[PDB]
Design a protein around this ligand. Sequence first.
Ligand SMILES: O=C(O)CNC(=O)C(=O)O
Ligand SMILES: [Mg+2]
Ligand code: NI
Ligand SMILES: [Zn+2]
Length: 331
Amino acid sequence: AQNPNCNIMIFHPTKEEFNDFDKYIAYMESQGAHRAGLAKIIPPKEWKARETYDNISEILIATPLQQVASGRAGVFTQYHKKKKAMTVGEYRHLANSKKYQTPPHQNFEDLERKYWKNRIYNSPIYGADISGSLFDENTKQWNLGHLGTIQDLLEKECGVVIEGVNTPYLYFGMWKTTFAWHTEDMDLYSINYLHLGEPKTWYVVPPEHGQRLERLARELFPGSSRGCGAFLRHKVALISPTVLKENGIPFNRITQEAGEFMVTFPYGYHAGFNHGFNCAEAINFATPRWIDYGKMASQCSCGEARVTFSMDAFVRILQPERYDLWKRGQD
Ligand SMILES: O=C(O)CNC(=O)C(=O)O
Ligand SMILES: [Mg+2]
Ligand code: NI
Ligand SMILES: [Zn+2]
């Protein structure tokens, strides 16, 4: 069995290997990359996502989210308070302000210490989940707006034609902006490209050990657990590496820098934080190996998780028994 310790693997494809996206994912899995839940892909040196980032400041963040924490430093939830719209140029200036900017630090490990010590005492503002793309249309390789769609994969594997679309999302971050512990909708893959700015630190639990994280989360968030049998789908809970180590949960960590891709694999729980002003693009995707994960994915039916139009068909076709209850949660 390849990668039996479930370490995060880092890949350096050549420009030739960068042509066929599906083939490269399948290659990485042949080497055991999925066992970690997360992999890093460094694009070939010849590749670029677009020519420059000089003209992005007029993109609108219609609903910036202030991430307000509750709990203790290593075990907390966050809620998202909606703020007034602002442009990317306005948000960059805010991220760089004395109130929100990255503190002085020695290295990524020092910054990680400072994040876990201090995150809860601040409420950073995240421009998340903005439909759109920063890939130039002429970028033919690993262009996250030109991937094969999940609907077409389901149709190719299973023969059923379904409605829905699959488009990318932009994330504009600042110091301390936080992504809570989650797997993807329907336990899909994700791919994330850091277009510019400061790094993003990731934490990940191997898919084979995801239920260990779930059982800890039910212990640590006991009211949330009573409210919903899949409350990590709400995407609000944080647990620090120190707490994970104290409770024996297997995980790994890695820092993504500008110009690098990360892939999350089906049922790979992940969480993380931004080091400073940055912009990432991400999208979900599927492969043949996902289908079985999709059929077994948990679902929130309490009403909190509320998701896209296109998840309807995935539930309806892969999980017909759950469909009725889940749809009640969506309505
Ligand atoms: O970058 C972020 O805030 C969150 N991204 C992801 O969870 C992802 O790409 O799967
Ligand atoms: Mg612009
Ligand atoms: Ni994710
Ligand atoms: Zn729920």
